[PDB]
Amino acid sequence: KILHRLLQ
Amino acid sequence: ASLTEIEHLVQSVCKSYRETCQLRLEDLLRQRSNIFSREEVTGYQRKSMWEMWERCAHHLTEAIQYVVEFAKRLSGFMELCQNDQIVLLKAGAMEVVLVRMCRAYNADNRTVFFEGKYGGMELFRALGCSELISSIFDFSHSLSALHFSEDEIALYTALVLINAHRPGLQEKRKVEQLQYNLELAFHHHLCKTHRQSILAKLPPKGKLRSLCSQHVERLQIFQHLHPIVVQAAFPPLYKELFS
Numbered sequence: 001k002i003l004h005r006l007l008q
Numbered sequence: 009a010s011l012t013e014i015e016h017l018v019q020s021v022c023k024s025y026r027e028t029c030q031l032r033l034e035d036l037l038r039q040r041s042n043i044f045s046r047e048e049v050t051g052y053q054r055k056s057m058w059e060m061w062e063r064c065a066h067h068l069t070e071a072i073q074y075v076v077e078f079a080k081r082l083s084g085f086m087e088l089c090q091n092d093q094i095v096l097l098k099a100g101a102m103e104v105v106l107v108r109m110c111r112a113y114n115a116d117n118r119t120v121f122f123e124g125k126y127g128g129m130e131l132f133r134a135l136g137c138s139e140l141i142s143s144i145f146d147f148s149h150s151l152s153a154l155h156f157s158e159d160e161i162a163l164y165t166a167l168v169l170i171n172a173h174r175p176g177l178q179e180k181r182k183v184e185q186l187q188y189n190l191e192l193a194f195h196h197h198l199c200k201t202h203r204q205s206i207l208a209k210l211p212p213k214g215k216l217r218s219l220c221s222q223h224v225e226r227l228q229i230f231q232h233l234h235p236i237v238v239q240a241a242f243p244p245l246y247k248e249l250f251s
């Protein structure tokens with residue numbers, strides 16, 4: 001997920 | 009939290025907000041006379057619906073990226089499990105963007121800063137959701153009337169996100185504590201500045217959720233009629249949060 005990536 | 013500590017939270021949230029805005033408020037105000045011509049408005053209106061959706065979803069996605077950066081800056085957020093971070097962002101990121109939109113809205117002529125100039129709601133007519141767009145502009149008009157300070161919009165947007173009632177939270181009591189700290193900071197700040205009168209004038213709860221629901225419903229219709237466009241030309245972050 002993009003969102004997982006953006007979160008770290 | 010104690011008094012100095014509540015006030016430090018106010019300050020931290022304000023700085024996080026200011027640091028994660030797309031554009032500086034002074035640059036938006038200085039551009040208020042720069043308004044799309046009739047010809048330019050017509051150009052937008054005549055664009056195909058799929059292309060205008062794609063373009064608008066691109067700008068929405070960029071705005072969402074800034075909200076994720078804001079969330080990451082709030083105390084406690086980065087310490088929540090990823091499930092809960094994503095629960096909060098799915099439920100609230102679009103709400104935050106709709107609140108932030110008031111910075112780009114000129115209540116005097118009912119225009120918004122979009123792609124380098126100010127235009128009215130009629131700029132977006134190609135999307136085929138004019139009732140929704142009208143409701144969004146009216147929501148910005150309601151927020152403009154409040155004349156938020158930076159502190160007030162920073163804290164109010166933090167509270168849109170940090171909401172312990174969201175279905176799916178695995179650490180509900182932690183989020184409860186974070187939300188309470190923020191509420192106490194917000195209300196303290198309003199008490200100190202003689203601005204408690206705004207609390208009665210904030211949008212009813214339900215209003216933001218209804219705008220966000222309308223978007224998802226409209227998206228469902230779009231994606232059904234144009235699935236390859238969504239697959240090929242909408243941003244992944246948008247699809248992850250809304251599809």
Ligand SMILES: CC1(C)CCC[C@](C)([C@H]2CC[C@]3(C)[C@@H]2[C@H](O)C[C@@H]2[C@@]4(C)CC[C@H](O)C(C)(C)[C@@H]4CC[C@]23C)O1
Nearest residue numbers: 061064065067068071109112120121122135137144223
């Ligand atoms: C999904 C799609 C296509 C169709 C369904 C309806 C929305 C969500 C509209 C409604 C409001 C909408 C017109 C939005 C656009 O995507 C993106 C803008 C936008 C973020 C675009 C960039 C601008 O500088 C600004 C002022 C910050 C606006 C505010 C208004 C907003 C949110 O659009």
